[PDB]
Structures are given as structure tokens and as C-alpha cells.
Homo-oligomer: A and B are copies of this chain.
Amino acid sequence: SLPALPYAYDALEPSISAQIMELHHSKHHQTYVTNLNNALKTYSTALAANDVPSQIALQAAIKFNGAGHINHSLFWENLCPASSPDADPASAPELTAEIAKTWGSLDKFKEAMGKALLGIQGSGWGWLVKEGSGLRIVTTKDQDPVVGGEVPVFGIDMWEHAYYLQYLNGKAAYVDNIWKVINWKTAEQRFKGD
């Protein structure tokens, strides 16, 4: 039951291969949405049956898979082809300004992110979040969401499956190349909010 990417599978080349995008979407993400759907269906049954032992395990399944589904979804909306105007950081004036108030420059921040991204041990994500008025950079393990009271602005997937087929162990290269497909329109929309 899974919505199509806002773009083609090769729309993010050469930063991210058509191969990686299809596998990430039709296999990794799909799996989370499927097992989420499954867990959600059984749960309606376990309620009526008054199966409390089941409801506990299904609470685990729903939390875990719902997190994976949301992470990749936030992710696909964080990306656009490199040519698109949504790639140019002027699309996020108010945010970038707060970036430079906090880290000084755009680049002093891309650097700060890169460092945190490549410092993740295992699987996880890197997030630019909003906390109150200021910004932190945070990382999350596995499919954990950001701690409460932070608002995702944009995320970078640092699971190996997100780059391995193209960059092998070269995660530093992967990180240098994603900046070219980041969607600053979206980061702006989420920096302001509702």
C-alpha cells in the first residue's frame, strides 16, 4: 500500500544510483509498511478477542515498523534532483539564516553534520532538528525517532543499505554527494511548521 517516490528512480543520480533508490524503496521501506499493515490488522483482532499478550507484541511491531516507515518517508521528501530549484539553499532563507546564527556558515554546518553522520556506530540517521527556537544536530540509532520536543527538519539515512551498492565502505563520499540532492524547500516548510 505504498506511495510512489516524488521522482524517478534515477532522478538523484549520480549522487544516489537508480539501483539504490529502487531497492531502498521497494524492499526496505516496503517491508516496514507491509509489516506495519500486518501488525495493525492483527491488533484489531486482538482487541476484540481480548488477547492482551498479543496486544503487547503488536505494540512492539507497530512502534518499530511505523518508525521505519516514517523515517524513509521524511527522507524521500528531503530529496529532489540536483537541478531543481528546491536544491538551492536560498529556498530556505529563514532556516539557513538560523543555520548561520548557530554554526556561523552553511559550510561550517555541512561540516558539523558530516562529522556527526560518519561518527554513527552501526545503523542510524542524522537529523537537523528544531528544538524550541534553536537548532541541534542529532543522530538516532536504527529506526528510533528523534527525542520528543525535537522537530525533524531533514534527515540523512546512514544505514549501510542506503549507500553500500554504490559507495562500498566509502560513506564519506556518500555524504559529500548527498548535499547536491537535499530539498531545502521541505526543510524550510518543516522549520516553520503549522
Contacts and interface: CB of A to CB of B under 8 A. Distances in A.
A63 B55 CA distance: 11
Interface in A11-70: 23, 27-28, 31, 33, 36, 40-41, 43-45, 47-53, 55-56, 59-60, 62-64, 66-67, 69-70
A51 B131 CA distance: 17
A141 B122 contact: yes
Which range contains the number of A residues in contact with the other chain? 35 or more
B36 A145 contact: no
A23 B70 CA distance: 32
A2 to B, nearest CB: 8
Interface of A is mostly: helix
A89 interface: no
A45 B66 contact: yes
Contacts of A145: 48-49, 56, 59
A159 B160 CA distance: 8
Give the number of times this chain occurs in the complex, counting copies.
8
Contacts of A74: 52
A49 to B, nearest CB: 5
Interface of A: 1-3, 23, 27-28, 31, 33, 36, 40-41, 43-45, 47-53, 55-56, 59-60, 62-64, 66-67, 69-70, 73-74, 77, 121-124, 131-134, 136, 138, 141-143, 145, 147-148, 159-161, 164-165, 168-169, 194
Given A50-B3, A143-B121, A161 B159 contact: no
